[PDB]
Design a protein around this ligand. Structure first.
Ligand SMILES: [K+]
Ligand SMILES: [K+]
Ligand SMILES: [K+]
Ligand SMILES: [K+]
Ligand SMILES: [K+]
Ligand SMILES: [K+]
Ligand SMILES: [K+]
Ligand SMILES: [K+]
Ligand SMILES: [K+]
Ligand SMILES: [K+]
Ligand SMILES: [K+]
Ligand SMILES: [K+]
Ligand SMILES: [K+]
Ligand SMILES: [K+]
Ligand SMILES: [K+]
Ligand SMILES: [K+]
Ligand SMILES: [K+]
Ligand SMILES: [K+]
Ligand SMILES: [K+]
Ligand SMILES: [K+]
Ligand SMILES: [Mg+2]
Ligand SMILES: [Mg+2]
Ligand SMILES: [Mg+2]
Ligand SMILES: [Mg+2]
Ligand SMILES: [Mg+2]
Ligand SMILES: [Mg+2]
Ligand SMILES: [Mg+2]
Ligand SMILES: [Mg+2]
Ligand SMILES: [Mg+2]
Ligand SMILES: [Mg+2]
Ligand SMILES: [Mg+2]
Ligand SMILES: [Mg+2]
Ligand SMILES: [Mg+2]
Ligand SMILES: [Mg+2]
Ligand SMILES: [Mg+2]
Ligand SMILES: [Mg+2]
Ligand SMILES: [Mg+2]
Ligand SMILES: [Mg+2]
Ligand SMILES: [Mg+2]
Ligand SMILES: [Mg+2]
Ligand SMILES: [Mg+2]
Ligand SMILES: [Mg+2]
Ligand SMILES: [Mg+2]
Ligand SMILES: [Mg+2]
Ligand SMILES: [Mg+2]
Ligand SMILES: [Mg+2]
Ligand SMILES: [Mg+2]
Ligand SMILES: [Mg+2]
Ligand SMILES: [Mg+2]
Ligand SMILES: [Mg+2]
Ligand SMILES: [Mg+2]
Ligand SMILES: [Mg+2]
Ligand SMILES: [Mg+2]
Ligand SMILES: [Mg+2]
Ligand SMILES: [Mg+2]
Ligand SMILES: [Mg+2]
Ligand SMILES: [Mg+2]
Ligand SMILES: [Mg+2]
Ligand SMILES: [Mg+2]
Ligand SMILES: [Mg+2]
Ligand SMILES: [Mg+2]
Ligand SMILES: [Mg+2]
Ligand SMILES: [Mg+2]
Ligand SMILES: [Mg+2]
Ligand SMILES: [Mg+2]
Ligand SMILES: [Mg+2]
Ligand SMILES: [Mg+2]
Ligand SMILES: [Mg+2]
Ligand SMILES: [Mg+2]
Ligand SMILES: [Mg+2]
Ligand SMILES: [Mg+2]
Ligand SMILES: [Mg+2]
Ligand SMILES: [Mg+2]
Ligand SMILES: [Mg+2]
Ligand SMILES: [Mg+2]
Ligand SMILES: [Mg+2]
Ligand SMILES: [Mg+2]
Ligand SMILES: [Mg+2]
Ligand SMILES: [Mg+2]
Ligand SMILES: [Mg+2]
Lengths: 77, 102, 46, 93, 62
RNA sequence: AAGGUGAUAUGAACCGUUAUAACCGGCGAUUUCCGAAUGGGGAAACCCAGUGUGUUUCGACACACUAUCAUUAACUGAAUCCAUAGGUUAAUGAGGCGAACCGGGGGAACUGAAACAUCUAAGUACCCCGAGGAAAAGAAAUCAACCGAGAUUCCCCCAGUAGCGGCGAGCGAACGGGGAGCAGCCCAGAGCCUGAAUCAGUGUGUGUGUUAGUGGAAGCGUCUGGAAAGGCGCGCGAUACAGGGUGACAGCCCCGUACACAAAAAUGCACAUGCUGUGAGCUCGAUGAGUAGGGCGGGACACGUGGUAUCCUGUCUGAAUAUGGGGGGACCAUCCUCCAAGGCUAAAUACUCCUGACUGACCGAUAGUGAACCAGUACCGUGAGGGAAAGGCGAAAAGAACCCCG
RNA sequence: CCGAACCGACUAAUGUUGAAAAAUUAGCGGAUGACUUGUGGCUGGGGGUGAAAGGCCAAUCAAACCGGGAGAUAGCUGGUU
RNA sequence: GUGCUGUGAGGCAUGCUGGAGGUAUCAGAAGUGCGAAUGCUGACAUAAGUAACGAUAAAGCGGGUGAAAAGCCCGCUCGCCGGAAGACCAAGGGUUCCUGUCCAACGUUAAUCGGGGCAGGGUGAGUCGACCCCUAAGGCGAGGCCGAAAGGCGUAGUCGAUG
């Protein structure tokens, strides 16, 4: 599923609106990318499917802190 | 417990046989009793070639509602009502009129 | 003339039988509905 | 071994009919009603133990029950198993 | 009759059970051939078999 | 308990009458096969195994294990040196079903606007996921207005008001007031003092229900009649004249009713008292960051971008952190008020597949359930699915022996 | 190529509350092929499939059937004891 | 049914039938009044004792049984099919099979007859078939990859005959 493994961001629904304000249903998808993260503490790369926002969260909190969150949630990597 | 039992001597309260006396031969779970010589009917019995064939017009007792008979108090010579009480740890019946155990 | 019902027991059971109904969630909702209505015969299964 | 408790349940009744009577006096074969799930080996062991005769071979068939009406009500009798039990020659039941 | 059966041992109960099953088979043969007049014996032996099996189950701690 | 072996449904063979007949209740035992179905498979109720214990008259037989996934543990174990992935085993849990109510993820159109696209219908119908006996919400970064209030939920007002709105059709608050109910706490951390409050579990008591039951008052004569409970006459009970039955309408014939009692066993509740875990108090600290806020696109707020506060966030960004920050409906100043980015929490509220009791200016066989009756049946359809008609002899079968035409 | 089985359906009569909700009878075309047929499988509704007729998709097709929104709406017709 | 009665909707009395309920007055509440809606359900008419009795292969007679025989049974003759209108399987059906008995309803007539009613009987496998071993198209599918959820695809596998 198009779900960020770090933040849990997922597709949401909303409307397209035209100039005449006709509403048609649409989705908003997260900006997801598969990325190999270097884990210094285990001397290996871990691949996560993450949003660009989630990549900024990893930059801020550190991959080790984030991976501990994932193990707490039961999210396998 | 039942106030009228098999082999009781009863007197008929209502019906064509009002005032007659007999002995209870059968108590039926439907609340009816067969009383000897009372509610007689004439049955047109067809012959049964299977066994013996006495096909004829037979007279026999029909069941009567048990509330249509009363226990007969021979001491007073009248219909009575039944009560229940415990004597020597056993439940017994007694006549309401003179309080004697049946 | 050839009519529309041409019976075959194998095709009957594969198309509508109990195990075919149990194979999908929509088929299990058929069975749930027929049980709630109280049908004596849940399926074509002989 | 087949246990004696099982052997005591597999034979249900003798089957009485013209074909059964002819089978007995022409081919030394008795006809039995047997339990629906009895095998040929169970029938053979039960006859030998309970009737005390030597059995040559057992043939079986399943009789399908008839649909019967009873005062508008529709019903169906049960299927049952019939066994033609050929006895060794000289044996008498 | 469960009282008198409760005295016997597991091995006596198993002999009694076997005896009832043979009797049940003999009665079944007589009934089928029309040679049984006391049909009430069929139910009697059937319920006796149930009594014995119940006690064999009670004695096994079951 | 003096009767009994359910109905159709007679009969047969029997059981029982002073207590192992039957019947009623508690606790047990047994409980084929299919079905989540779980040893593999499969056209449901069938086909075919493996392993281990036993047993055997050498033909064979009995019993027990053997699904998948999640978590944990042990042993093992690649590329690859350590490792990791992977593999095997064990323990524990999960799955399926169910009428409504509840929270969440998605989400119409007909229709109305006398056309129709914004708008409406409507976050309705419907699909999906998940829970509980209720759920959700909940202990102010809330309102108010310079006076004050003090978590959440529900009811009556405020008010069809203020507003929103092709300012059309329509949509529609809050503040404040009256009620039901009421309850507050913990982590982001050390020291002291200690095991102290408090909840949960498990034993044990005492009560109090629930699941069988016991006793339960008092009427006769006469008339009509097939039959009296009716008429007429004279009596009696009532903490009982609720109700049902009995050959017509019965307080006193029967079953009940008021009232008074009852439990070997299992169980609910409220106390009590053990046992287990839980920590109580004081002091000193600490005070939730990719967050608040912003740009862009949407959504939610009665509020349709409007002068539009506030809330949510798909995308791009991004503080201060108590000497600080949020809100007071554009915005600024002043003042007031509150403390987000962690969490728990009873009651008042919603519903009824199901059980008991009672009630109705509700129906009485074309009505009332589709179904008073063997109805979700017969029948129709490949299937999803659709779906009837059909109640009444008599008080009692006394259901018409026998004769006559055929 | 001629012609039976087999697959079709050009003409006529009959039939039209039929023997039959598409047939019968006499004739007719293909008949080693882009043939015909059995069994089983696959494609699903704005979708399928179509040597293309809007043909066919269970006697239903310019959007199948069943259930639901649902008592859609009906400035129209009928009826109103 | 009859008589009486009021301006009307109606009212009252009474014979017969019926065989256990009914209800003044004054108030109260409505599923409160039917001839129409090509209304709905049931019953019963009309046409009418009319059309028709389902291939124009075809019957005749003697005997039997029987309440009754054009239709059943037996016999002789005649006619019709014979690449079928004969024989035998698969599919589909499910007792229709055989014997006895019955003739209400069913059978487009009668029926003694029947695929009709009722009762009893009848299906015997190491070699035929299924199950079974093996696979096709295709299905499902541990992990897996993908997808708001439901789910989609598929690897190892496991099913699946029409071989
Ligand atoms: K099919
Ligand atoms: K299973
Ligand atoms: K619209
Ligand atoms: K309009
Ligand atoms: K229009
Ligand atoms: K009485
Ligand atoms: K009474
Ligand atoms: K705004
Ligand atoms: K209905
Ligand atoms: K109905
Ligand atoms: K082919
Ligand atoms: K098309
Ligand atoms: K169809
Ligand atoms: K369509
Ligand atoms: K009259
Ligand atoms: K009258
Ligand atoms: K009419
Ligand atoms: K006529
Ligand atoms: K016909
Ligand atoms: K005739
Ligand atoms: Mg819209
Ligand atoms: Mg043989
Ligand atoms: Mg066989
Ligand atoms: Mg399985
Ligand atoms: Mg299994
Ligand atoms: Mg297999
Ligand atoms: Mg569940
Ligand atoms: Mg409009
Ligand atoms: Mg809660
Ligand atoms: Mg203040
Ligand atoms: Mg009592
Ligand atoms: Mg009393
Ligand atoms: Mg009197
Ligand atoms: Mg009467
Ligand atoms: Mg804070
Ligand atoms: Mg804010
Ligand atoms: Mg923001
Ligand atoms: Mg802003
Ligand atoms: Mg914005
Ligand atoms: Mg932001
Ligand atoms: Mg502000
Ligand atoms: Mg302001
Ligand atoms: Mg009805
Ligand atoms: Mg009526
Ligand atoms: Mg059908
Ligand atoms: Mg064609
Ligand atoms: Mg032709
Ligand atoms: Mg040519
Ligand atoms: Mg040719
Ligand atoms: Mg559709
Ligand atoms: Mg055209
Ligand atoms: Mg068609
Ligand atoms: Mg359309
Ligand atoms: Mg609607
Ligand atoms: Mg309508
Ligand atoms: Mg009145
Ligand atoms: Mg009306
Ligand atoms: Mg009328
Ligand atoms: Mg009119
Ligand atoms: Mg007409
Ligand atoms: Mg007519
Ligand atoms: Mg005529
Ligand atoms: Mg005419
Ligand atoms: Mg004419
Ligand atoms: Mg004519
Ligand atoms: Mg004919
Ligand atoms: Mg003749
Ligand atoms: Mg003829
Ligand atoms: Mg039959
Ligand atoms: Mg025949
Ligand atoms: Mg016959
Ligand atoms: Mg006839
Ligand atoms: Mg006749
Ligand atoms: Mg016959
Ligand atoms: Mg027949
Ligand atoms: Mg797959
Ligand atoms: Mg999987
Ligand atoms: Mg495969
Ligand atoms: Mg295979
Ligand atoms: Mg094959």
């Amino acid at each position: 599923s198009r779900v960020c493994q770090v933040t849990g961001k997922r597709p949401v629904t909303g409307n397209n609106r035209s100039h005449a304000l006709n509403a048609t249903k649409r989705r908003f998808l997260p900006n997801l990318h598969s990325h190999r993260f270097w884990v210094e503490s285990e001397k290996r790369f871990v691949t996560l499917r993450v949003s660009a926002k989630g990549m900024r969260v990893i930059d801020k909190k550190g991959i080790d802190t984030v991976l501990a969150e994932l193990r707490a949630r039961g999210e396998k990597y | 417990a039942a106030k009228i039992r098999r082999d009781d001597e009863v007197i008929v309260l209502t019906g064509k046989d009002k005032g007659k006396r007999g002995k209870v031969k059968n108590v039926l779970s439907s609340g009816k009793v067969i009383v000897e010589g009372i509610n007689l009917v004439k049955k047109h019995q067809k012959p049964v070639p299977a066994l013996n064939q006495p096909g004829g017009i037979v007279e026999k007792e029909a069941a009567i509602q048990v509330s249509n008979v009363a226990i007969f108090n021979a001491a007073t010579g009248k219909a009575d009502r039944v009560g229940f009480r415990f004597e020597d740890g056993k439940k017994v019946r007694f006549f309401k009129s003179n309080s004697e155990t049946i | 003339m050839k009519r529309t019902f041409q019976p075959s027991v194998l095709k009957r059971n594969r198309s509508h039988g109990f195990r075919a109904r149990m194979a999908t969630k929509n088929g299990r909702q058929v069975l749930a509905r027929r049980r709630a209505k109280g049908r004596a015969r849940l399926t074509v299964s002989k | 071994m087949i246990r004696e408790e099982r052997l005591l349940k597999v034979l249900r009744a003798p089957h009485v009919s013209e074909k059964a009577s002819t089978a007995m006096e022409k081919s030394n074969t008795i006809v039995l009603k047997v339990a629906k799930d009895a095998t040929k080996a169970e029938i053979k062991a039960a006859v030998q133990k309970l009737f005390e005769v030597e059995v040559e071979v057992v043939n079986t068939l399943v009789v399908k029950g008839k649909v019967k009406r009873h005062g508008q009500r529709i019903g169906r009798r049960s299927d049952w198993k019939k066994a033609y039990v050929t006895l060794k020659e000289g044996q008498n039941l | 009759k469960a009282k008198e059966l409760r005295e016997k041992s597991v091995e006596e109960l198993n002999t009694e059970l076997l005896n009832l099953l043979r009797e049940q088979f003999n009665l079944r043969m007589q009934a089928a051939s029309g040679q049984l007049q006391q049909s009430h014996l069929l139910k009697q032996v059937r319920r006796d078999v149930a009594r014995v099996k119940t006690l064999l189950n009670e004695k096994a701690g079951a």
